[PDB]
From Swiss-Prot, chains A, E, F:
Heterohexadecamer of 8 large chains and 8 small chains; disulfide-linked. The disulfide link is formed within the large subunit homodimers. Isolated reduced and oxidized M35 binds holo-RuBisCO (RbcL(8)-RbcS(8)) but neither subunit octamer alone; RuBisCO has a higher affinity for reduced M35. M35 binds RuBisCO via its SSUL domains; the SSUL domain binds close to the equitorial domain of RuBisCO between RbcL dimers, with 1 M35 protein per dimer. Colocalizes with RbcX throughout carboxysome formation. PANTHER family: RIBULOSE BISPHOSPHATE CARBOXYLASE, RIBULOSE BISPHOSPHATE CARBOXYLASE LARGE CHAIN. It comes from Synechococcus elongatus (strain ATCC 33912 / PCC 7942 / FACHB-805) (Anacystis nidulans R2). GO terms for cellular component: carboxysome. The gene is cbbL. NCBIfam families: PRK04208.1. This is Ribulose bisphosphate carboxylase large chain. HAMAP family: RuBisCO_L_type1 (MF_01338). SUPFAM superfamilies: RuBisCo, C-terminal domain (SSF51649), RuBisCO, large subunit, small (N-terminal) domain (SSF54966). The modification N6-carboxylysine is found at K182. Substrate binds at N104, T154, K158, R276, H308, S354.
Swiss-Prot record, chain B:
Heterologous expression of 12 carboxysomal genes in E.coli (ccaA, ccmK2, ccmK3, ccmK4, ccmL, ccmM, ccmN, ccmO, ccmP, rbcL, rbcS, rbcX) leads to the formation of bodies that resemble carboxysomes, have densely packed paracrystalline arrays and RuBisCO activity. These structures open the door to generating carboxysomes in plant cells to increase their photosynthesis and productivity, as well as tailoring bacterial microcompartments to specific metabolic needs and molecule delivery. It comes from Synechococcus elongatus (strain ATCC 33912 / PCC 7942 / FACHB-805) (Anacystis nidulans R2). It is found in: Carboxysome. Protease inhibitors do not alter the appearance of M35. In isolated carboxysomes M35 is 4-5 fold more abundant. In the N-terminus has a gamma-class carbonic anhydrase-like domain (CA), while the C-terminus has 3 repeats that are similar to the small subunit of RuBisCO (rbcS), called SSUL. The SSUL are connected by flexible linkers. The N-terminal domain forms a scaffold on which CA and maybe other carboxysomal proteins assemble, while the C-terminus binds RuBisCO. At least 2 SSUL domains are required for initiation of carboxysome assembly. Isolated reduced and oxidized CcmM35 binds holo-RuBisCO (RbcL(8)-RbcS(8)) but neither subunit octamer alone; RuBisCO has a higher affinity for reduced M35. Disruption phenotype: Single gene deletion does not form normal carboxysomes, and does not grow in normal air but in 2% CO(2), called a high-CO(2) requiring phenotype, HCR. CcmK2 and RuBisCO are targeted to an abnormal large polar body in some studies, RuBisCO is soluble in others. When ccmL-ccmM-ccmN-ccmO are deleted no carboxysomes form, cells are HCR and RuBisCO is soluble. It comes from the Bacteria. Disulfide bonds join C37-C55.
From Swiss-Prot, chains C, G:
Belongs to the RuBisCO small chain family. GO terms for molecular function: ribulose-bisphosphate carboxylase activity. Heterologous expression of 12 carboxysomal genes in E.coli (ccaA, ccmK2, ccmK3, ccmK4, ccmL, ccmM, ccmN, ccmO, ccmP, rbcL, rbcS, rbcX) leads to the formation of bodies that resemble carboxysomes, have densely packed paracrystalline arrays and RuBisCO activity. These structures open the door to generating carboxysomes in plant cells to increase their photosynthesis and productivity, as well as tailoring bacterial microcompartments to specific metabolic needs and molecule delivery. Induction: Carboxysome size and components vary with growth conditions. When grown in ambient air at medium light (50 uE meter(-2) second(-1)) there are 853 RuBisCO complexes (RbcL8S8) per carboxysome, the numbers decrease under low light and high CO(2), and increase under high light (at protein level). The keyword Phosphoprotein does not apply. SUPFAM superfamilies: RuBisCO, small subunit. It is found in: Carboxysome. RuBisCO catalyzes two reactions: the carboxylation of D-ribulose 1,5-bisphosphate, the primary event in carbon dioxide fixation, as well as the oxidative fragmentation of the pentose substrate in the photorespiration process. Both reactions occur simultaneously and in competition at the same active site. This is Ribulose bisphosphate carboxylase small subunit. GO terms for biological process: photorespiration; reductive pentose-phosphate cycle.
Length: 440, 86, 106, 142, 440, 440, 106
């Protein structure tokens, strides 16, 4: 394999797809033979030579491993850099790119463990995809929300609430000053609360809160469904009700469904929030699986206006947040960006920080993510001693106090506590929230 | 405890099944929302029936269900309503 | 515990106490620093469904002082005091609006 | 969590969904507290208590860990057996079953590593699905 | 037959479908042999054994008679309990279940008379059905109607009124304080009044009455039609007009049409009222036919938000009201409930008490049915000395005066007269009504 | 009631719908008052007189009881003849007619028991209905089958056979010389055999058997389904496969679905076999319910080419066979025909004799039904000592030997045994069959 | 005979004379006995098409005395005297709203 597939002097083309694999070889296997094997197994390599191979240009569709480097301070662990020709892949298909790259190599025997760290999508390939149905700039335009991160809240409990009780909790959150509320990942269409009821009462909760406050409100209606026909039936009803935004679980529901939906979202002008349910199955362990950075990149292509990214490794997160927001991201290994990536004017995806955050985290989250982000306060809103609405106001005052102090030149890391304490003096809602949750 | 209930507990213990119990108030019963009672960790017939009598007296005015438990498979082999509020 | 009063809000900074001239200036200082172009907008109503407000004069493109914007806010205040007045910023590199905060309420 | 979600004397219903998880707890974390945590994180468990929870029957939609056993000949590694009510899931949806069971627990911090080993689908749930378009017997016939 | 089909030692599985039959065996035929034959003739039983039978597992699809008991205080009458395997049935089909159980046995010669008393639907089977489009809880939410039974009224005369005069009657009834009005069972699309005209004028009556009162009003528009395509045409137009509710005669129109329509209702958020026209052909006689309780259970599976139940044997009616409302119903023979029945979170159906009731019945009806019912006053509303609107007010005051009295702790059986008499002192409409109809 | 609704001097119009009811009045209630009440409660009759009644012509829509007679040789039992105006009914709707006539009266309290014996459909009404998709005459043309009754067979066992083994049984039955095979009533789409597989394998059995024999073969594919959309899906696939015929259970599936399907059948040239599953719930008991004759007439309007009628009270059956076959049927009480009935050139429905019949019945069945019938041999075919195909040949020879003997002038009642015995001499298949089943 | 007046209603008990404090307490006693949780809602208008009214504080979950609800109605009256005030109740076992009756009209 090494004579053919390990090509350490090959310099990749701008049209190539590039993959970075972290691997451990089995004891006895050298790293070079292992890297060559990854290149073969992810492209053309096979145990026997057949006559039909002589009917084709074999060299043409061949994955080349062009660089192998040892991982610093970790024994028997290497990065392989593999280049794939543009002819390998179906245009506009995330499904095909995965099936091609990650379809076989992970079950390869001479490798102890394999983890895909980064993919470079060549511009020639990027142009075949739709991208996000709207992206960051268009989303802010459609909702009239500028100069601050957007605020969210997941309704709790996860299961149990009637459609009407659900809408009540939604309404109270939204009137309080949140931009969004969301369905929980596992809320689909259970016996306690059927989807079309929940859609109907939530639509009405949005109207009341939008009429009260006079700001655009929305709620990420979960359109994730058992079939593509059910999914479209739900998305279509959310359009009928004049809902700005819907959500989908791209990993559990899969890429084919997600791409279908993102096309529909473009055509019907509905924003698309993407939940990353089931990601830690694939992306948690360092030694094996697919790093989330890659799945983020795929989703930007597949389509999604928002994407959950977690709360804050710090540098790795800041890396893939750039990958999903920026147009040109220079390769930087400190942030885990292996390849320089250009997006050829494909719009960015908003990151959503979510889970286990309360008002004291606010100055930190503003400093980390900036204005192009959604922040989500599930228990942070509903857990307030006075209820959803004063809970939401407390977050909204906290956020706007931070943004203002950031713009005024105050350091949000050193002065962050004082900024909140100051806004607590004129906001009783916030002062209550600052008493309940301990300072971080 | 009635004779019919004792006969069932006798039958289950002879077959080597464990005796389980769950209660529900009048409201929860209607939604089929049960709550597990203090577990009877015995095989001896005298000790099991003594704990069952103690269980029914604790949950007066509540629906009490008796459960036959296969401990190998962790499955319910038997379910019978043994008390009702009135 | 207290119940939240029903109050109409006007997007960013509308949950803070109304901005003093010194506070407005500091926000404009930020915009000059980022290289955004300030624009003063006004409207009789603030309906969420409506995207556009009427533009007061023209955006201040080569804006070096915050006072230059404050003077245009003061002018629009006397001309349309019955109106809501808003300050909007523009990123010519990202080619989009980046700032939009209320300054005057009728 | 252990007082609520670890229920070692609970005997599952024929209508329950059952999950077997192989897990390693982080050093210091006991296995029972870790198993209880898997049950909570895969069902309802959350860092704060909200008022809206009192508007619903909380016990009803609760994942119970009913058995914890150590893996034979492997240190700091345990099987947790978790029962889920049939009310948790959308009918005919594999997507929902996954999102519900494997959607959050794997990113849980007190667990070093988690692997889902087996699921018991209750017959009441099986009947909501189509199954194979033809199956083995029909395929050989065709 | 007895050796194979009569299995007294058999314990029924939780997946089994259970049927309770009341039978009289023809003189000479013993009860055991006759019970086994009911099990045979309703499952597989046939006069000859053919070669094809040996190509299949025979025991598998066989109905077992596991209990026979003589009916107390009745000669030559027996209950036979029969278990059927889950495999026998097409999923989500009431039609198939009836065809399978009641398809042949009733014409069996060795039985003098057969009556199907109860069916246990196993949870495995229940889950294959949609159930009611909305159910009790969702319906109160959709209508904002809490803590009292809902009031209805049937427009008299049955035939004859023009569509405009019809709407006039409707409007006056609804403006007086009824929640609903309803089309008569046989009102469909005759020459004197075409359906589409009626729907149009009724919709205008609802709008006017709703705006005047500020409460949600409805009218059960009869969409029962000669074909499924006609039915859907009517249902669709009722949705177009923004009507909250429609009615259907399930027994005359059939189960297939009913199941079609309940699926449509779920998809379009319309509430489905079910009228039990033709039921006493099947369920009146004690000795022969199908008891209504069984048809009610079947309807809860097929789908329907409301179902007519009658007015008030008492204990029998209180029995099947629980079967159509609750989630879990224990076996209680005094109330005619033969098997314990779990609905596995399928929503309840609102019982509709109708027929020859007036203000004086009101306290008894509230004690009997409670808050989750529809009470229907045809002549009780229109027969008022002052006309429809004060007629309605009289009923509505009577109802709310009872509900208040019940909650205040007063005994609606001993004090029921005094409760109305007291409410007559401040309501002139009610005082008039109390004078026309004599106290019961 | 008697003054208004009991009109003994009334002569019924030709446009009137006429109904014959058998009733027992509760002790105390006289027959005349009870007859008037049947007329009232089935038309307009109500407990109170409301103001809206005066906005309409009351006499117009009123059912008149024009004749009452005591049933001969029965105490406390009377026939009441009731006339209904044509205006009362929606055109082309069986559903409406039933809802109107049988909707309420059966639950009337002053009547001990009610049975609807006959209905006269007026020609004006008959013309609004499609009738059978094809009728007797067209059906013989489509199948090239003249001068003999058609032979059928139901595949046993009822449940259990795989779709392929099912088709095998079908094929062997048809190749032996039967015209039709049929799905069992409860065969729909269970787990052991899904409908679409069955339709596919049955279609191949028909092709093979048709090519071998050179005669048109068919199988009544059961398209009875949980919804109308499912039913149409099955019907449509049967057409795709080029199947001549389908079956439906009209009483379980309902009239709306049946009317839908018969319209579809007309439009697509498919023949419609109708199975009367669940009929003995309604029509067994003499004292209460609806006699089958009425349901048969209703089916002829709704549509169906074949209808199960039973095998052989004799004169009653010979009565309604005429009602379903002929154009004009004179009133003959001995044969249970209450009213003279004209079909105004609506085509006849083929009666289907089925159930526990074998070769020895063949001569009697030919004398009773004649050439326009379907004779069905379930166990008579499959129960043959040599299997399905010679089993079929045995029946077919028996049939053609009878039909020949009938035409030759021989008396099929006196000579019926000798006719078969003679045909056994040259047909070994038949001789075997004559030995297994004993002579009747 | 008399013609019925045209009048706006507000669902349960609105056809009765306006409930006195003693009558309101009597209804709360019923809710406590039934184990429903009282909630006070207020709204400026009363449109049938709208599902929601603004929650006054939070539902009284550990409610034992009716006086506890009346005190919260008294407070909501002083703060929102121009609004319609309603008493809602919750069954947490049936997981639905069970009560909803008006207590104040402006």
């Amino acid at each position: 394999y090494k004579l053919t597939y390990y090509t350490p002097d090959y310099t990749p083309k701008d049209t190539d797809l590039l993959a970075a694999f972290r691997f451990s070889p089995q004891p006895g296997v050298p790293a070079d033979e292992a890297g060559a094997a990854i290149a073969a197994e992810s492209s053309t390599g096979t145990w026997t030579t057949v006559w039909t191979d002589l009917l084709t240009d074999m060299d043409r569709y061949k994955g080349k491993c062009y660089h192998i480097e040892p991982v610093q301070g970790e024994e028997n662990s290497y990065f392989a850099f593999i280049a794939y020709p543009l002819d390998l892949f179906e245009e506009g298909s995330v499904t095909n790119i995965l099936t091609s790259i990650v379809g076989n190599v992970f079950g390869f025997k001479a490798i102890r463990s394999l983890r895909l760290e980064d993919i470079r999508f060549p511009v020639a390939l990027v142009k075949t995809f739709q991208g996000p149905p709207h992206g960051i700039q268009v989303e802010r335009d459609l909702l009239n929300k500028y100069g601050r991160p957007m605020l969210g809240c997941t309704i709790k409990p996860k299961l149990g609430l009637s459609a009407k009780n659900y809408g009540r909790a939604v309404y109270e959150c939204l009137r309080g000053g949140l931009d969004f509320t969301k369905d929980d990942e596992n809320i689909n269409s259970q016996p306690f609360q059927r989807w079309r009821d929940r859609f109907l009462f939530v639509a009405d909760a949005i109207h009341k809160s939008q009429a009260e406050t006079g700001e655009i409100k929305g709620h990420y209606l979960n359109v994730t469904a058992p079939t593509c026909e059910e999914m479209m039936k739900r998305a279509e009803f959310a359009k009928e009700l004049g809902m700005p935004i819907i959500m989908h679980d791209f990993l559990t529901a899969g890429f084919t469904a997600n791409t279908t939906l993102a096309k529909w979202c473009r055509d019907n002008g509905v924003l698309l929030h993407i939940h990353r349910a089931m990601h830690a199955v694939i992306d948690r362990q360092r030694n094996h699986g697919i790093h989330f950075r890659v799945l983020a990149k795929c989703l930007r292509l597949s389509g999604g206006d928002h994407l959950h990214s977690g709360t804050v490794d710090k540098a790795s997160t800041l890396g893939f947040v750039d990958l999903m927001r920026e147009d040109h991201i220079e390769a930087d290994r400190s942030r885990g960006v292996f390849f320089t990536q250009d997006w050829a004017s494909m719009p960015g995806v908003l990151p959503v920080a979510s889970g286990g955050i309360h008002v004291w985290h606010m100055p930190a989250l503003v400093e980390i993510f900036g204005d192009d982000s959604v922040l989500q306060f599930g228990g942070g809103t509903l857990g307030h001693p006075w209820g959803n609405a004063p809970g939401a106001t407390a977050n909204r005052v906290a956020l706007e106090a931070c943004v203002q102090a950031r713009n005024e030149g105050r350091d949000l890391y050193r002065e962050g506590g004082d900024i909140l304490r100051e806004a607590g003096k004129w906001s009783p809602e916030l002062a209550a929230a600052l008493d309940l949750w301990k300072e971080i | 405890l009635s004779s019919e209930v004792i006969t069932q507990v006798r039958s289950l213990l002879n077959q080597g099944y464990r005796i389980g119990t769950e209660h529900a108030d009048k409201r929860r019963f209607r939604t089929s929302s049960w709550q597990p009672c203090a577990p009877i960790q015995s095989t001896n017939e005298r000790q099991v029936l003594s704990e069952l009598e103690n269980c029914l007296s604790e949950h007066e005015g509540e629906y009490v269900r008796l459960l036959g438990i296969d401990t190998n498979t962790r499955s319910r082999v038997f379910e019978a309503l043994i008390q009702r509020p009135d | 515990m207290k119940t939240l009063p029903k109050e109409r809000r006007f997007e960013t900074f509308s949950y803070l106490p109304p901005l003093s001239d010194r506070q407005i200036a500091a926000q404009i200082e930020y915009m000059i620093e980022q290289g955004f172009h300030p624009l003063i907008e006004f409207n009789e109503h603030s309906n969420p469904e409506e995207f556009y407000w009427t533009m007061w004069k023209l955006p201040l493109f080569d804006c070096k002082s915050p006072q230059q914007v404050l003077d245009e806010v003061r002018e629009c205040r006397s001309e349309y005091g019955d109106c809501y007045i808003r300050v909007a910023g523009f990123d010519n590199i990202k080619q989009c609006q980046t700032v939009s905060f209320i300054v005057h309420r009728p």
